[PDB]
Design an enzyme around this catalytic site. Structure first.
Site: not given
Ligand SMILES: *[C@@H](C(=O)OCC)[C@H](O)C(=O)N[C@@H](CC(C)C)C(=O)NCCC(C)C
Length: 220
Positions: A19, A25, A163, A187
């Site tokens: 990514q 993620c 993540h 991952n």
């Molecule tokens: C995941 C990512 O790229 O992490 C670094 C490796 C993103 O940060 C992500 O989308 N996280 C997500 C929760 C995960 C999918 C369990 C999140 O924080 N979502 C927040 C709400 C969303 C509607 C914007």
């Protein structure tokens, strides 16, 4: 249920992707789960476009490189009527305007299923469905440097996940502590991370890192 499952051996799983420095993620978790279910249906493994999700699934609640959720991605594919292949809509690790083209769609879904928040339920789903999208607390330096073995981080949270990743199976190996069970997790940080891009995450250790707290898969 089985003691060991590895959907890679059945052909359900594309190679490990990367990514980059985009917070996407959720899109890689979602494409991985849909790749598995599409293969289950058609017998063809086709790599799917994370960029398509990043650029286009805002109306379902996703925020591109600023984050998202796998269920929202599954809802987009249903609402949109398709999802383009990786080859046709390649990954750029940045958010741009939506360029979806249905002529190049290779996947569909009719919704999604959220798994009860129990590792026993996750185990049943992995054993009978295919690869499953999951959320984990990856926010620890120990996860960055993981090389092999069963990952266990005492400071890991079972409620605050950050993540999205993909459970492609589960298994066991003898360990010093006799905590021998693991989830086999794909991952999206390239194959140089972990074991060819995979991690064995502690299984049946009180929902370690929240792996069973937000698990789901698309309906195909
Ligand atoms: C995941 C990512 O790229 O992490 C670094 C490796 C993103 O940060 C992500 O989308 N996280 C997500 C929760 C995960 C999918 C369990 C999140 O924080 N979502 C927040 C709400 C969303 C509607 C914007």
């Amino acid at each position: 249920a089985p003691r060991s499952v590895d959907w890679r051996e059945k052909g359900y799983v594309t190679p490990v992707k990367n990514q980059g420095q985009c917070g996407s993620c959720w899109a890689f978790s979602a494409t991985g789960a849909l790749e598995g279910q599409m293969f289950r249906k058609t017998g063809r493994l086709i790599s799917l476009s994370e960029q398509n999700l990043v650029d286009c699934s805002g109306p379902q609640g996703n925020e591109g490189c600023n984050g998202g959720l796998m269920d929202y991605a599954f809802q987009y594919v249903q609402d949109n009527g398709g999802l383009d292949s990786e080859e046709s809509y390649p990954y750029e690790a940045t958010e741009e305007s939506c360029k979806y083209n249905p002529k190049y769609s290779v996947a569909n879904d009719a919704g999604f299923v959220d798994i009860p928040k129990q590792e026993k339920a996750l185990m049943k789903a992995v054993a009978t469905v295919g690869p499953i999208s999951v959320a984990i607390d990856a926010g620890h330096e120990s996860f960055l440097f993981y090389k092999e073995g069963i990952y266990f981080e005492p400071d890991c949270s079972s409620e605050d996940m950050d993540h999205g990743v993909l459970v492609v199976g589960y298994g066991f190996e003898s360990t010093e502590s006799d905590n021998n069970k693991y989830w086999l997790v794909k991952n999206s940080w390239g194959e140089e991370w972990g074991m060819g891009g995979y991690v064995k995450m502690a299984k049946d250790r009180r929902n370690h890192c929240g792996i069973a707290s937000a698990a789901s898969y698309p309906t195909v």
